[PDB]
Design an enzyme around this catalytic site. Structure first.
Site, mmCIF file in Angstrom:
data_model
loop_
_atom_site.group_PDB
_atom_site.id
_atom_site.type_symbol
_atom_site.label_atom_id
_atom_site.label_comp_id
_atom_site.label_asym_id
_atom_site.label_seq_id
_atom_site.Cartn_x
_atom_site.Cartn_y
_atom_site.Cartn_z
ATOM 1 N N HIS A 1 0.821 -1.210 0.000
ATOM 2 C CA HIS A 1 0.000 0.000 0.000
ATOM 3 C C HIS A 1 0.853 1.256 0.000
ATOM 4 O O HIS A 1 0.368 2.327 -0.354
ATOM 5 C CB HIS A 1 -0.937 0.052 1.206
ATOM 6 C CG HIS A 1 -2.106 -0.878 1.108
ATOM 7 N ND1 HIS A 1 -2.918 -0.937 0.001
ATOM 8 C CD2 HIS A 1 -2.605 -1.776 1.991
ATOM 9 C CE1 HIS A 1 -3.867 -1.837 0.200
ATOM 10 N NE2 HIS A 1 -3.700 -2.356 1.400
ATOM 11 N N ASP B 1 -2.723 -10.675 -2.394
ATOM 12 C CA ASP B 1 -3.311 -10.116 -1.191
ATOM 13 C C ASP B 1 -4.737 -9.683 -1.548
ATOM 14 O O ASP B 1 -4.996 -9.312 -2.683
ATOM 15 C CB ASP B 1 -2.458 -8.944 -0.689
ATOM 16 C CG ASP B 1 -2.959 -8.362 0.608
ATOM 17 O OD1 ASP B 1 -2.324 -8.619 1.650
ATOM 18 O OD2 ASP B 1 -3.981 -7.637 0.589
ATOM 19 N N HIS C 1 -6.319 -7.150 -0.831
ATOM 20 C CA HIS C 1 -6.393 -5.714 -1.041
ATOM 21 C C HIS C 1 -5.556 -5.277 -2.247
ATOM 22 O O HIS C 1 -4.547 -5.887 -2.581
ATOM 23 C CB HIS C 1 -5.942 -4.971 0.216
ATOM 24 C CG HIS C 1 -6.802 -5.232 1.415
ATOM 25 N ND1 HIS C 1 -6.504 -6.199 2.351
ATOM 26 C CD2 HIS C 1 -7.950 -4.647 1.834
ATOM 27 C CE1 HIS C 1 -7.428 -6.198 3.294
ATOM 28 N NE2 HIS C 1 -8.318 -5.266 3.001
ATOM 29 N N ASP D 1 -4.870 -12.741 3.134
ATOM 30 C CA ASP D 1 -6.122 -12.269 3.715
ATOM 31 C C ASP D 1 -7.319 -12.590 2.804
ATOM 32 O O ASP D 1 -8.452 -12.247 3.122
ATOM 33 C CB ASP D 1 -6.069 -10.769 4.022
ATOM 34 C CG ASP D 1 -5.231 -9.982 3.024
ATOM 35 O OD1 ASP D 1 -4.836 -10.508 1.944
ATOM 36 O OD2 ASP D 1 -4.979 -8.803 3.339
ATOM 37 N N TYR E 1 -4.556 -12.012 8.298
ATOM 38 C CA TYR E 1 -4.719 -11.666 9.724
ATOM 39 C C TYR E 1 -5.329 -12.770 10.594
ATOM 40 O O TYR E 1 -5.466 -12.614 11.815
ATOM 41 C CB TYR E 1 -5.540 -10.383 9.823
ATOM 42 C CG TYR E 1 -4.893 -9.327 8.990
ATOM 43 C CD1 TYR E 1 -3.730 -8.699 9.421
ATOM 44 C CD2 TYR E 1 -5.386 -9.009 7.731
ATOM 45 C CE1 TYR E 1 -3.100 -7.746 8.635
ATOM 46 C CE2 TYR E 1 -4.763 -8.045 6.931
ATOM 47 C CZ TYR E 1 -3.622 -7.415 7.393
ATOM 48 O OH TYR E 1 -2.995 -6.467 6.615
HETATM 49 O O1 LIG Z 1 -4.298 -6.102 4.565
HETATM 50 C C1 LIG Z 1 -4.289 -4.942 4.164
HETATM 51 C C2 LIG Z 1 -4.997 -3.865 4.980
HETATM 52 C C3 LIG Z 1 -6.183 -4.233 5.506
HETATM 53 C C4 LIG Z 1 -7.097 -3.182 6.105
HETATM 54 C C5 LIG Z 1 -7.817 -2.391 6.627
HETATM 55 C C6 LIG Z 1 -8.749 -1.386 7.255
HETATM 56 C C7 LIG Z 1 -8.723 -0.059 6.888
HETATM 57 C C8 LIG Z 1 -9.589 0.820 7.524
HETATM 58 C C9 LIG Z 1 -10.465 0.379 8.521
HETATM 59 C C10 LIG Z 1 -10.494 -0.960 8.899
HETATM 60 N N1 LIG Z 1 -11.365 -1.508 9.941
HETATM 61 S S1 LIG Z 1 -10.888 -2.809 10.880
HETATM 62 O O2 LIG Z 1 -11.964 -3.532 11.465
HETATM 63 O O3 LIG Z 1 -10.203 -3.805 10.095
HETATM 64 C C11 LIG Z 1 -9.692 -2.338 12.121
HETATM 65 C C12 LIG Z 1 -8.439 -2.222 11.556
HETATM 66 C C13 LIG Z 1 -7.361 -1.862 12.344
HETATM 67 C C14 LIG Z 1 -7.562 -1.631 13.705
HETATM 68 C C15 LIG Z 1 -8.824 -1.757 14.296
HETATM 69 C C16 LIG Z 1 -9.922 -2.123 13.492
HETATM 70 C C17 LIG Z 1 -9.618 -1.812 8.248
HETATM 71 N N2 LIG Z 1 -3.664 -4.542 2.932
HETATM 72 O O4 LIG Z 1 -3.014 -5.437 2.116
HETATM 73 K K LIG Z 2 -4.037 -7.708 -4.535
HETATM 74 ZN ZN LIG Z 3 -4.459 -7.026 2.516
#
Ligand SMILES: O=C(/C=C/C#Cc1cccc(NS(=O)(=O)c2ccccc2)c1)NO
Ligand SMILES: [K+]
Ligand SMILES: [Zn+2]
Ligand SMILES: [K+]
Length: 355
Positions: free
Chosen positions: A133, A171, A173, A264, A304
């Site tokens: 990212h 991934d 995302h 993920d 995760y």
């Molecule tokens: O894997 C990845 C990134 C994944 C992501 C994300 C994201 C973004 C905005 C909001 C939330 N809300 S939460 O519930 O997932 C949450 C997240 C973190 C702390 C507390 C709650 C998540 N990239 O390759």
């Molecule tokens: K991807």
């Molecule tokens: Zn991801």
């Protein structure tokens, strides 16, 4: 020859001091490593040492301002750490954060080097924080520096600038940073499969859509496979590889393959909502192994569910080591068929294998 593995416990030091249940947990990588050991995969591997990336290596993709800002976090007290973190989209910072980001990158350089010097045939990098990212000038979505993108450039720096590097990003995302860094670049083919939901899914940009195919000489060299309309799994991912990833990749004839390997999209993942299986990941990996004379580097990104990521990444290393694919499907969800047809329509003018 053999399969390389890099892992360093120090990358566990990056942590969230205000929320120790933040899903990007330190024990993500230690659970993965443990599992490689339990399955006796670790001892079948050549252990590649971790190292810090240099600031000069970071400037392969990142601005000096961004590097300095992130580096400065090293001495900050919690109040300023929190303040600096809040300036980005989804970032927490601790004093060890910058060190851990350098280690992650450096680890991948060393692995790419082992591959490119012929020390190993392929390799796995069990690393955190993730990177895809991260943009040239900013941090984003748990990522400080774009580890995969940096590695592509590092590989080009020790071979030749135009070295054909394929980056497959599975991934769940979209790798906004990776796409942007190479968007005008025809030496680096970026292929990403990601949940999209018309911009409702993180990182919530229309850049992730299928019609973003690259700019300038890099036109055609950016392939987005966006998912819409709920859960996807092995059948959808096998189809996208079958119809898109592999035919485009073969045609590109990469000299090196980097996988942005977030897990993920795994069954069980709380952020992803998909159901790709360990076996599924193994087959994906086994297909990529047919490219670039097997020179494949698997780099951990997101993912995760500690058990899911441990099981899935282990299965990938199993395939790199040359173990036989586990046995595997079902009719596609209709929207997945639409997604693939869309990409096919969008990239048919650039790749004869799609025609
Ligand atoms: O894997 C990845 C990134 C994944 C992501 C994300 C994201 C973004 C905005 C909001 C939330 N809300 S939460 O519930 O997932 C949450 C997240 C973190 C702390 C507390 C709650 C998540 N990239 O390759
Ligand atoms: K991807
Ligand atoms: Zn991801
Ligand atoms: K590109």
């Amino acid at each position: 020859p053999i399969t390389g593995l890099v892992y360093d416990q120090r990358m566990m030091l990056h942590h969230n001091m205000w929320d120790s249940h933040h899903p990007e947990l330190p024990q993500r990588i230690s659970r993965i490593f443990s599992r490689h050991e339990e399955l006796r995969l670790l001892s079948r591997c050549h252990r590649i040492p971790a190292r810090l990336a240099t600031e000069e290596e970071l400037a392969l993709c990142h601005s000096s301002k961004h590097i300095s800002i992130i580096k400065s976090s090293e001495h900050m007290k919690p109040r300023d750490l929190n303040r600096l973190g809040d300036e980005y989209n989804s970032i927490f910072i601790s004093n060890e954060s910058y060190t851990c980001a350098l280690l992650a990158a450096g680890s991948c350089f060393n692995s790419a080097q082992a591959i490119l010097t012929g020390q190993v045939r392929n390799a796995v990098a069990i690393v955190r924080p993730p990177g895809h990212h991260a943009e040239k000038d900013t941090a984003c979505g748990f990522c400080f520096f774009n580890t995969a993108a940096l590695t592509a450039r590092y590989a080009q720096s020790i071979t030749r600038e135009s070295l054909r590097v394929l980056i497959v990003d599975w991934d769940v995302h979209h790798g906004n940073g990776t796409q942007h860094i190479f968007e005008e670049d025809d030496s680096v083919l970026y292929i990403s499969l990601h949940r999209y939901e018309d911009g409702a899914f993180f990182p919530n940009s229309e850049d992730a859509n299928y019609d973003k195919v690259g700019l300038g000489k890099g036109r055609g060299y950016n392939v987005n496979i966006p998912w819409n309309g709920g859960k996807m799994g092995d059948p959808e991912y096998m189809a996208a590889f079958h119809h898109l990833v592999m035919p485009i990749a073969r045609e590109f004839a990469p000299e090196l393959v980097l996988v942005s390997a977030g897990f993920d999209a795994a069954r069980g993942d709380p952020l992803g909502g998909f159901q790709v299986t360990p076996e599924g990941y193994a087959h994906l990996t086994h297909q990529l192994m047919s490219l670039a004379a097997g020179r494949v580097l698997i780099i951990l990104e997101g993912g995760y569910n500690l058990t899911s990521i441990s099981e899935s990444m282990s299965m990938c290393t199993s395939m790199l080591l040359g173990d036989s694919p586990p046995s595997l499907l079902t009719p596609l969800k209709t929207s997945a068929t639409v997604s693939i047809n869309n990409v096919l329509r969008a990239h048919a003018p650039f790749w004869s294998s799609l025609r």
